[PDB]
Write a protein that binds this DNA or RNA. Structure first.
Lengths: 252, 82, 70, 676, 92, 99
RNA sequence: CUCCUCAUGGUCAGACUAUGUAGGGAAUUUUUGGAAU
């Protein structure tokens, strides 16, 4: 538990992309399909945790080759406080100020987990609904299953009933999740390529993980954003409390 | 202002001794001390460098002409220790 | 000059007279207040116990570290 | 060995009294392992030696070779903050360190509350070493002084080792380690963490304030953005000292940084950086100058593209300061290119500077593959006999033309069309210009414009032209233009041929409508058209070219443009815009020249901030000695007269010791020449 | 503006002698209040007539149990207070 | 400019100060105040028979002259304050330069 | 380094205290000498 064992365990996370596979769904032009690069995914895996869910937003736009294809150019990492199997996330980011944003649409969001599901769980669906309630109905989700030796990209969609369910049922609600059942989620079309690449946006304070900053995190609150390199889930910037406790161990 | 100026203002009402640039010594009660060290003195006994001593009622000497003052030891307590 | 505070110091006057006393305070003009100050003239000979004294900065030539504070 | 060969294991013994082969065998043994550690270059049979970057680092920071290869393998592209301490511990200088049973209780207390986790365990000395390192960063003095002695050792050698690792990663071009290592180096230097605020390293900043900021859980950027002093005092929630804090903030480095990238060609990419420095200087706190490491790294932050150290002096702060550099791309990154590269500035001293501005690639489209120049056919047969009138054959003081000039001669001397003659400095562009001038005269034309940007070589060329060209045609007036618009106008009238810089003749020709002499100019030689790339003046010179072409189109005038230039990849486009045809254009490669010339470029370290250093000077002297011992004559170029004087005295000192001070002439002959 | 006026007044005033001394690197002789004289070159000056003097030769007059004798010594690097200056003479 | 600053530069320098009263001082300047009050250490002092003193502070107005070592670099020490004043005081077409 | 001025941030009912790319410390009471003999 705590910082030591998981943080030490974080170094091995580059090994999880040596083997990458998905259960291959039938490719269909009828619905829009996503093209995700191998570097952004790798960096997100590195920043993420073995246990706790790490989740960012993802942005991009339609290329002129196919309007139905959506290229994910810009990952947007946001203020959040993660738990095991659940996470608290801030609002939709206001990134109009930055350059290299000419009408970048909101494609969806991405997150980590350790359980292999064909559907989105309650803690995920409720969060999805809270983010996108009245804002974008057809946005997608990327659920990354992560285990030592390989990772798996499980994409998902959502229908209009799930948003209502998330609006009504936020805290706890395990039975209404059970009744919610597998069916509502629909497996979205996602691809992994080395033929394109992308970049990250990060908050102005450059601390995206508010795990141990409990007072500073605000679930609805404004933040400035900037381009940069994101940090590790357990990184010196994310663990300031530990230094005052470390020197406080000897005291004075 | 000077801290010794502040002490010297505390010395008002006491008996002090004054040596001037000429060397004459004036002992008496200090009436008034300005910021410029000009001092008003009462009932002064004066000892000249030749040794002759005189008495005078009211004397006022310029600051610039004073070599030094000696003030009573009462003031040494405070608050200039800080 | 702040390090010299509380020390026993020897001040040489304009007229050549030597004063010795504890340095309690100074100011911009280098007016010094000297506690338990005594005067020596020729070098002990002609030594007098003055007591608490101010000295003017216009008259002061130099000061040296005499002894440690009381 | 000489004294007792078998004691120290000389096998050679009777053989080689001087132990030549024993010495050489040890050298072989050394250079194998060194080469394995990529410290030096070596070849067994050919036997050539040169030093590498890693070897230079080991030399500078005096790292043992074992420590060196340990760094080599244990450092990786993906290595993280946890692994950095482990590698530091693995450094061979700690081989003699071992854990102790009286140390063990304090170790146990530490490793619980240690911020940076340890993959190893209490029994292992490496773990003890890096926890001592952590304590040192965190300022922990100790009671049990065994630990404190070890941490003294770490105090003296730690910034060394860490700084070495950082330099190594920087040479390797690895993004994840280099930034974290730079932070660690800073932490060894200034003794603090990132989470401890940078206000700690100010000597005048008080203790209560820094405690309050540590405990306030606030991003550093916000405090830096705060301006109003009273508002800073309110933000730091103590009304006292706020003004002091704000003063010290403006004494903390703050940079408004911008970068505009732009491709030169498809492979080469030039970055124009605008680096502004807003902070106010202090000689006490900042020191002599501010070294700032400028990192150009990829979109992930994985590998380093390009790096440089730059010195911000007291003079630069507040000025708008541009910095330029070039980078060649990869093959795949050439084909498909990223959304942006990250440009990050970090202070080698100041904490949490961290200014990273994205270098924007959005729809940057690279140009086409470079087209090769027109081929050089094998023909020598063109000579001075081919030209029509034989008075023009007494000019060139040679008979047979060059290989490159023979190629252009047909379009040049015979026809009147617009010619891009093109390339090379050595191959005479002067000669080709002369031929063009003769062709122009031959048709009873008479107005000629020879334009070179270099005003000193214009004068030389005038001195050579007026004594010879002018008298053969027999009337022609060759002149150079002066600063006056009026005087150079009267010259524009009086003179058949005008020689001027682009600035001069553009200024005179700006009114073509009003000066009708300039509407009538039939022939032009644009000499060194490759200098249109050069700064604003090149832009002036293309303004002149564009103006002339606009005059040709507007007036329906036949104006023969002879564009003389250097080797240019984009040359054909340049000729196209000038009213030319692909057949008329002649572009050649630099390798086409007739005197094969070895360009030997040699790179040295820490030279970016200086005109020259002492190794450069030695190598120059060695080259000069090679030339002087040979029959060749040699020359060296220098930035200033001051630099020339310095190098001259230096050369004399080098020469006086060695055999050659030689002037190849007696010492009594030289004074008669230098009498003045 | 004030700085400009001060420098100018200094240039056209009596100060012009010590300004001219620094620029020409000419020797000047200074009659001091100690009844000693300093003939030297002016390396630097001040409004108070504080001066950095090089190649100092100071000349003085001493009385003994017979005829008055002049005495002199060389001080290569000398810095001088401004109040000791009675007179600064510039000459060939 | 102000020569007193030039004296401020003179810390850790061995000097012989002649004084208005005629006193000769020999010692290493620890500091000089802007008043030109000079504090020195390891001082041999001769009043107009030398007295050896750990530390001596002299009031600036009493200083007649201070004789500096001949090794001192006056060219370098004199020019400071002007540079400090200059530091206190301190579009397309930018690159005259090209590629 | 020190005192003043000024600016400032704070506190108290003008004073005090930290900081300052600040100005200053030659015309009567102090630091640019009425001292010299």
């Amino acid at each position: 538990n705590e910082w030591r064992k998981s943080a030490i365990a974080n170094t091995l996370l580059y090994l999880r992309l040596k083997n990458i596979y998905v259960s291959a769904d039938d490719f269909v032009e009828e619905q829009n399909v996503y093209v995700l690069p191998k570097n952004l995914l790798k960096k997100f895996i590195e920043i993420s945790d073995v246990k706790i869910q790490v989740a960012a937003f993802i942005y991009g736009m339609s290329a002129k080759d196919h309007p139905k294809v959506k290229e994910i150019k810009t990952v947007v990492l946001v203020p959040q406080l993660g738990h095991v199997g659940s996470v608290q996330i801030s609002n939709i980011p206001d990134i109009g100020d930055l350059p290299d944003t000419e009408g970048l649409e909101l494609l969806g969001w991405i997150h980590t987990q350790t359980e292999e599901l064909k559907f989105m769980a309650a803690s995920e669906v409720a969060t999805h609904s809270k983010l996108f309630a009245d804002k974008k109905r057809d946005c997608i989700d990327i659920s990354i299953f992560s285990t030592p030796g390989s990772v798996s990209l499980s994409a998902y969609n959502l229908t209009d009933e799930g948003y209502q369910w998330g609006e009504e049922n936020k805290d706890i609600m395990n039975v209404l999740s059970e009744g919610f059942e597998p069916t509502f989620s629909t497996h979205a079309q996602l691809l992994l390529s080395d033929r394109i690449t992308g970049n990250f946006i990060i908050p102005s304070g450059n601390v995206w993980n508010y795990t141990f900053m409990g007072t500073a995190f605000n679930q609805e609150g404004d933040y400035n954003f900037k381009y940069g390199i994101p940090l590790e889930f357990y990184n010196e910037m994310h663990r300031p409390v530990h230094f005052l406790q470390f020197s406080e161990l000897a005291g004075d | 202002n000077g801290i010794p100026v502040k002490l010297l203002n505390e010395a008002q009402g006491h008996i002090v001794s004054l040596e001037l640039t000429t060397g004459a010594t004036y002992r008496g009660k200090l009436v008034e001390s300005e910021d410029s060290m000009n001092v008003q003195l009462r009932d002064v006994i004066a000892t000249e460098p030749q040794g002759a001593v005189t008495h005078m009622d009211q004397i006022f000497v310029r600051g610039s002409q004073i070599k030094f003052i000696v003030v009573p030891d009462l003031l040494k307590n405070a608050p200039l220790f800080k | 000059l702040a390090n010299l505070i509380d020390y026993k110091l020897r001040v040489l006057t304009q007229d050549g007279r030597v004063y010795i006393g504890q340095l309690m305070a100074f100011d911009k003009h280098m007016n010094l207040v000297l506690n338990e100050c005594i005067e020596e003239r020729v070098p002990k000979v002609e030594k007098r116990v003055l007591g608490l004294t101010i000295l003017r900065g216009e008259q002061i030539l130099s000061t040296v570290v005499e002894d440690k504070p009381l | 060995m000489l004294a007792s060969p078998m004691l120290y294991k000389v096998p050679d013994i009777s053989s080689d009294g001087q132990l030549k082969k024993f010495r050489e065998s040890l050298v072989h043994s050394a250079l194998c392992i060194l080469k394995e550690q990529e410290l030096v270059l070596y070849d067994a049979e050919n036997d050539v030696i040169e030093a590498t970057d890693l070897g230079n680092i080991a030399s500078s920071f005096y790292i043992n070779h074992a420590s060196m290869d340990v760094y080599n393998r244990e450092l990786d592209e993906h290595t993280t903050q946890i692994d950095l301490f482990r590698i530091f511990s693995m450094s061979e200088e700690f081989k003699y360190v071992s854990v102790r049973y009286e140390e063990k209780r304090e170790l146990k207390q530490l490793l619980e509350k240690a911020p940076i986790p340890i993959r190893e365990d209490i029994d292992d000395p490496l773990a003890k070493v890096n926890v001592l390192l952590q304590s040192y960063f965190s300022q922990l003095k100790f009671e049990g002084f065994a630990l404190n002695s070890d941490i003294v050792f770490i105090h003296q050698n730690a910034g060394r080792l860490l700084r070495a690792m950082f330099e190594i990663c920087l040479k390797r071009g690895w993004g994840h380690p280099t930034r974290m290592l730079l932070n660690l180096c800073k932490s060894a230097t200034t003794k603090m963490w990132p989470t401890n605020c940078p206000l700690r390293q100010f000597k005048t900043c008080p203790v209560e304030v820094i405690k309050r900021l540590e405990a306030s859980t606030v991003p550093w950027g916000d405090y830096l953005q705060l301006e109003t002093p009273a508002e800073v005092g309110r933000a730091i929630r103590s009304e006292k000292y706020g003004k002091q804090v704000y003063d010290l903030l403006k004494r903390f480095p703050k940079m408004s940084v911008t970068c505009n990238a732009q491709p030169i060609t498809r492979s080469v990419m030039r970055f124009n950086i605008e680096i502004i420095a807003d902070w106010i200087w202090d000689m006490n706190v900042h020191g002599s100058l501010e070294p700032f490491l400028l990192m150009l790294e990829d979109t992930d932050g994985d590998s380093i593209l390009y790096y440089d150290v730059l010195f911000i002096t007291p003079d630069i702060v507040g000025h708008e300061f541009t910095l330029s550099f070039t980078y060649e791309l990869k093959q795949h990154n050439q084909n498909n290119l990223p959304p942006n590269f990250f440009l990050t500035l970090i202070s080698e001293n100041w904490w949490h500077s961290e200014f990273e501005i994205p270098v924007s690639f959005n729809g940057f489209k690279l140009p086409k593959k470079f087209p090769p120049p027109t081929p050089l056919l094998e023909n020598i047969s063109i000579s001075t006999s081919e030209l029509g009138n034989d008075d023009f054959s007494e000019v060139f003081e040679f008979k047979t033309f060059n290989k490159i000039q023979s190629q252009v001669f047909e379009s040049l001397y015979n026809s009147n069309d617009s010619v891009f003659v093109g390339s090379g400095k050595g191959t005479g562009k002067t000669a080709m210009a002369e031929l063009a001038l003769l062709n122009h005269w031959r048709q009873n034309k008479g107005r000629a414009v020879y334009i070179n940007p270099s005003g000193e070589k214009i004068d030389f060329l005038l001195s050579d032209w007026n004594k010879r060209f002018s008298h053969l045609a027999g009337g022609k007036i060759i002149n150079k233009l002066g600063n006056d618009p009026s005087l150079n106008l009267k010259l524009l009238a009086k003179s058949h041929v005008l020689l001027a810089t682009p600035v001069q003749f553009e200024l005179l020709s700006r009114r073509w409508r009003q000066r009708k002499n300039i509407q009538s100019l039939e022939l032009m030689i644009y000499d060194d058209a490759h200098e249109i790339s050069q700064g604003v003046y090149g832009a002036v010179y293309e303004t002149l070219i564009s103006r002339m072409i606009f005059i040709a189109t507007q007036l329906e005038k036949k104006i023969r443009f002879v564009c003389l230039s250097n080797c240019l990849a984009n040359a054909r486009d340049f000729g196209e815009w000038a009213g030319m045809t692909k057949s008329n254009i002649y572009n050649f490669s630099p390798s086409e020249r007739i005197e094969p010339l070895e360009i030997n470029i040699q790179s040295f370290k820490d030279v970016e901030h200086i005109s020259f250093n002492f190794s450069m000077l030695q190598m120059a002297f060695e080259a000069s000695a090679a030339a002087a011992g040979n029959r060749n004559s040699s020359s060296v170029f220098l930035p200033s007269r001051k630099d020339c004087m310095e190098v001259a005295s230096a050369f004399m000192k080098f020469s006086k010791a060695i055999e050659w001070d030689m002037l190849n002439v007696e010492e009594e002959q030289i004074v008669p020449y230098i009498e003045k | 503006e004030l700085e400009e006026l001060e420098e100018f007044e200094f240039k056209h005033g009596p100060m012009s002698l010590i300004n001219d001394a620094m620029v020409t690197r000419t020797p000047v002789i200074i009659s001091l209040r100690n009844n000693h004289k300093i003939i030297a070159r002016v390396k630097a000056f001040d409004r108070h007539c504080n001066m950095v003097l090089e190649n100092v030769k100071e000349l003085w007059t001493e009385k003994k149990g017979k005829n008055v004798i002049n005495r002199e010594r060389f001080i290569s690097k000398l810095f001088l207070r401004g109040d000791s200056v009675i007179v600064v003479l510039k000459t060939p | 400019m102000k020569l007193v600053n030039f004296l401020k530069k003179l810390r850790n320098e061995q000097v012989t100060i002649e004084l208005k009263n005629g006193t000769t001082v020999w010692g290493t300047l620890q500091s000089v105040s802007p008043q030109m009050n000079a504090i020195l250490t390891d001082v041999k002092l001769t009043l107009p028979n030398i007295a050896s003193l750990q530390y001596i502070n002299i009031r600036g107005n009493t200083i007649r002259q201070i004789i500096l070592p001949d090794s001192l670099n006056l060219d370098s020490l004199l020019v400071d304050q002007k540079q400090l004043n200059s530091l206190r005081r301190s579009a397309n077409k930018r690159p005259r330069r090209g590629l």
